[PDB]
Amino acid sequence: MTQRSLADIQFQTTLEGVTPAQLGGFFEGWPNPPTPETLWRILDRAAVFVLARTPDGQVIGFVNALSDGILAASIPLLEVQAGWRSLGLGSELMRRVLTELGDLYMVDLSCDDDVVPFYERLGLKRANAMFLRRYDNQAGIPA
Amino acid sequence: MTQRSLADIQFQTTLEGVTPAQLGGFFEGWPNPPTPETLWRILDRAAVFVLARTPDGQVIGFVNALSDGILAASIPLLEVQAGWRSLGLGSELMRRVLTELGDLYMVDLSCDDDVVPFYERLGLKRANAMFLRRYDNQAGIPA
Ligand SMILES: CC(C)(COP(=O)(O)OP(=O)(O)OC[C@H]1O[C@@H](n2cnc3c(N)ncnc32)[C@H](O)[C@@H]1OP(=O)(O)O)[C@@H](O)C(=O)NCCC(=O)NCCS
Ligand SMILES: CC(C)(COP(=O)(O)OP(=O)(O)OC[C@H]1O[C@@H](n2cnc3c(N)ncnc32)[C@H](O)[C@@H]1OP(=O)(O)O)[C@@H](O)C(=O)NCCC(=O)NCCS
Ligand SMILES: [Ca+2]
Ligand SMILES: [Ca+2]
Numbered sequence: 001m002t003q004r005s006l007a008d009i010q011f012q013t014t015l016e017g018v019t020p021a022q023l024g025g026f027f028e029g030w031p032n033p034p035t036p037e038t039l040w041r042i043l044d045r046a047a048v049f050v051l052a053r054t055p056d057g058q059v060i061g062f063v064n065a066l067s068d069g070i071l072a073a074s075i076p077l078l079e080v081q082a083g084w085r086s087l088g089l090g091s092e093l094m095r096r097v098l099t100e101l102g103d104l105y106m107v108d109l110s111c112d113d114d115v116v117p118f119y120e121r122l123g124l125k126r127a128n129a130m131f132l133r134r135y136d137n138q139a140g141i142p143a
Numbered sequence: 144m145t146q147r148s149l150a151d152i153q154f155q156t157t158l159e160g161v162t163p164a165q166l167g168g169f170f171e172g173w174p175n176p177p178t179p180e181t182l183w184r185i186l187d188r189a190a191v192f193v194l195a196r197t198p199d200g201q202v203i204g205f206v207n208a209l210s211d212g213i214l215a216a217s218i219p220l221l222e223v224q225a226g227w228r229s230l231g232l233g234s235e236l237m238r239r240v241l242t243e244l245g246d247l248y249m250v251d252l253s254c255d256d257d258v259v260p261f262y263e264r265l266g267l268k269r270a271n272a273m274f275l276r277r278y279d280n281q282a283g284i285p286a
């Protein structure tokens with residue numbers, strides 16, 4: 001329950017063929033996570049996103065992005081399920097979402113100190129993220 | 144060419160009655176700024192935005208936001224024209240755009256060290272912003 005290969009991971013940028021039943025297992029460590037159904041809606045409302053799927057259709061990594069298509073984009077969420085980390089998938093998802101976004105002037109995201117090096121190795125630079133967290137709505141605004 | 148009052152500043156969240164001719168004077172300090180026509184398109188593509196206007200219809204402050212309406216939003220641009228700063232307008236624009244966004248779990252933005260206190264006084268907290276700047280496209284992706 002340990003050996004892995006990225007060789008039969010496939011990527012897609014639509015929800016065609018993806019059900020909420022295939023979006024379970026995310027939000028590791030979140031106290032009150034969006035459900036898989038809510039994740040599906042989050043993806044549907046993103047400007048762009050990238051999914052990494054095993055052959056059975058389970059989504060084991062994703063990234064989403066907000067964008068105006070003209071000047072700016074931001075990347076709210078990036079996650080690879082723990083058994084699939086350390087293979088380069090997170091970096092690959094980031095490269096793929098940047099391709100989907102195009103060469104916009106600004107692409108920005110927030111992170112904690114521990115993951116700064118992950119992002120620096122992708123070429124991102126570091127400034128201040130000012131933020132709000134409305135923890136009552138951590139599971140998402142309902143439909 | 145110095146006295147000001149916010150008393151006849153009006154706010155709006157649509158482009159009704161706003162022309163590109165009324166969106167001049169922004170991007171102070173930018174080497175290759177979006178034109179007013181491009182700014183109009185940026186606003187039109189935002190999830191939400193707030194404009195501050197004088198009685199003649201000139202826009203003298205704005206803020207925009209990207210959002211998925213479910214979990215996350217980000218604020219790419221905030222600017223008040225220099226003769227209108229130091230009256231509370233920037234803070235007011237921020238409060239108004241947060242109202243337009245609603246109580247989403249995440250609201251995030253990037254900034255330099257100098258403006259951190261402005262954002263802390265609005266209740267925002269500080270983390271790392273990881274970012275890319277594609278300076279060739281500073282004036283925006285064309286229509
Ligand atoms: C960050 C994340 C997406 C990286 O995915 P990944 O597929 O392992 O990415 P890569 O294989 O390209 O890079 C992995 C490297 O990133 C670094 N890294 C990732 N998370 C780290 C952390 N929390 N602390 C320290 N280093 C970290 C490590 O150098 C790691 O290499 P290692 O496995 O040899 O230690 C993954 O760790 C994850 O899903 N974490 C939980 C959610 C998260 O923190 N996402 C970031 C936005 S909040
Ligand atoms: C940041 C900005 C929007 C604030 O607008 P404003 O209408 O003056 O906002 P407020 O009146 O609510 O707050 C002003 C206070 O913010 C702080 N502040 C704003 N910019 C600052 C800066 N560059 N360095 C230090 N303090 C700053 C000061 O405390 C200032 O008070 P002061 O005029 O008495 O010195 C305005 O300075 C601006 O348009 N700057 C250029 C664009 C920008 O930096 N926007 C931020 C996103 S990049
Ligand atoms: Ca879509
Ligand atoms: Ca490894």
Ligand SMILES: [Ca+2]
Nearest residue numbers: 186187189190
């Ligand atoms: Ca609109």
Ligand SMILES: [Ca+2]
Nearest residue numbers: 228229230231
């Ligand atoms: Ca003042």
